[PDB]
Design a protein around this ligand. Structure first.
Ligand SMILES: OC[C@@H]1O[C@@H](O[C@H]2[C@@H](O)[C@H](O)[C@@H](O[C@H]3[C@H](O)[C@@H](O)[C@@H](O)O[C@@H]3CO)O[C@@H]2CO)[C@H](O)[C@@H](O)[C@H]1O
Ligand code: CL
Ligand code: CL
Ligand code: CL
Ligand code: NA
Length: 415
């Protein structure tokens, strides 16, 4: 007997970790679980192709932000039974509970697998050499920019590269998602979409969203982010932080685990950045402190011929044993609230900072059109970043891009 599962690259050796995670299940049920790893860059397309075509695995990993869109296509098995067997609504953070379905849906269509939220990794050696107290830098927008100015003026040089560090690296090339931008939007008291009456509408062109976007994008126009870094994607900026080329950058808690794994095994433990590694929350904006909170769930296709066995595997993967183990393997946080209290997560000082930052975590709504909204947003924000790279992003040009972004988004949401 056989299950097929699709997962994204959650850990250094994604197939092998997942295989080791499900071995006791394989033993106890006399079944083989076959796993296929999809790059995040391709996963949306493969998962919607499976959904329209009726050809795919029994189970797929789904990003929390995708659950609504795939559910609304009507292709997922209800999983209220699994969620009840795992302790129902009470067993989850309300933000995690809301990702188990398309907003307004009767039935749950995804089981929470792991959670993830964003914070600033920083070079403790580079901040110390620049005279930056991280508690000041990461308290506020004003502290953040004062710190980047200090990092820019620093005479510090990385002991291996023998070169200066950029103060901040953020990608300006393939903005797949708004994850990087959202906290600046939210911090200014903006939103990506707003519900008024029944209807969702873009708020990317609200004065608040525009203040936050302009603040963020203009840091690179002020020289805190080098030219180089606006022609790079997320994976390259990650590599650049690891290679000792930036003082500060925004990512999720998986980097903590990668910092403890040798180069040889797909980590960066040998690098100066790994041995001089700090974590601070996003600074509080003028209307409050937010960070992107997400993660991945697991869903069962309703065209599967292995539904009961697939539900047994969902129970196992959402359950306390596997929740703690997979979080360890991947460096993500568990989706199951109880598993947060495992000492292995409380005792890592960097992870403790991610856990405290979860208080200000903020999710996207679980909308049916969410794929097209995010896709339309990043396409126009892309063009904003191209203005930055030529030193031509004005508040007015940004308003124009976001007005158009908003027309396009409102049009898709009317569908
Ligand atoms: O839009 C989907 C959204 O993504 C999830 O975030 C992912 C993903 O977008 C990101 O590219 C991914 O990439 C990491 C690997 O997980 C990590 O192992 C290492 O290879 O580095 C890459 C590149 O940075 O990491 C996150 C976490 O899974 C959101 O969590 C979720 O809400 C989804 O809707
Ligand atoms: Cl692998
Ligand atoms: Cl991302
Ligand atoms: Cl929003
Ligand atoms: Na991205």
């Amino acid at each position: 007997k056989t299950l097929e599962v699709w997962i994204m690259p959650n850990s250094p050796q994604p197939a092998e970790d997942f295989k080791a995670l499900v071995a006791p299940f394989e033993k106890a049920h006399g079944v083989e679980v076959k796993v296929t790893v999809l790059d995040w860059g391709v996963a949306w397309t493969k998962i919607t192709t499976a959904a329209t075509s009726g050809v795919g695995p029994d189970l797929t990993q789904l990003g929390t932000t995708w659950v609504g869109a795939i559910s609304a296509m009507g292709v997922l098995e209800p999983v209220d039974d699994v969620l009840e067997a795992l302790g129902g609504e009470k067993a989850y953070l309300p933000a995690v509970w809301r990702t188990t379905r398309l907003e307004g849906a009767r039935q749950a269509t995804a089981v929470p697998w792991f959670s993830e939220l964003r914070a600033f990794y920083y070079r403790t050696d580079a901040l110390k050499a620049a005279g930056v107290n991280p508690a000041e830098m990461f308290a506020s927008w004003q502290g953040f920019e004062a710190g980047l100015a200090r990092l820019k003026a620093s005479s510090f040089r990385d002991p291996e590269t023998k070169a200066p560090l950029a103060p901040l690296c953020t990608p300006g090339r393939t903005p797949r998602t708004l994850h990087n931008a959202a906290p600046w939007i939210w911090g200014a008291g903006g939103e990506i979409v707003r519900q008024a009456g029944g209807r969702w509408q873009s708020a990317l062109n609200s004065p608040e969203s525009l203040e936050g976007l302009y603040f963020f994008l203009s840091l690179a126009q002020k020289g805190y982010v080098p030219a180089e870094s606006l022609e790079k994607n997320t994976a390259q900026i990650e590599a650049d932080f690891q290679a000792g080329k930036c003082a500060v950058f925004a990512s999720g808690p998986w980097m903590i685990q990668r910092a403890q794994v040798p180069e040889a095994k797909g980590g960066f433990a040998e690098r100066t950045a790994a041995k001089n590694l700090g974590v601070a929350p996003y600074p509080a904006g003028p209307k409050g402190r937010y960070t992107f909170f997400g993660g991945s769930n697991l869903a069962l296709f309703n065209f599967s011929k292995n539904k009961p066995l697939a539900k047994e595997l969902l129970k196992y993967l959402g359950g306390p044993e596997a929740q703690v183990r997979y979080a360890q393997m991947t460096g993500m946080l568990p989706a199951l609230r109880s598993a947060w209290s495992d000492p292995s997560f409380q005792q890592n000082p960097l992870l403790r900072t991610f856990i405290q930052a979860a208080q200000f975590g903020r999710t996207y709504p679980s909308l049916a059109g969410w794929g097209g909204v995010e896709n339309l947003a990043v396409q126009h924000l892309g063009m904003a970043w191209d203005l930055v790279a030529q030193g031509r992003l004005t508040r007015e040009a940004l308003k124009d891009l976001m007005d158009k972004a908003s027309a396009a988004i409102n049009q898709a949401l009317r569908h």
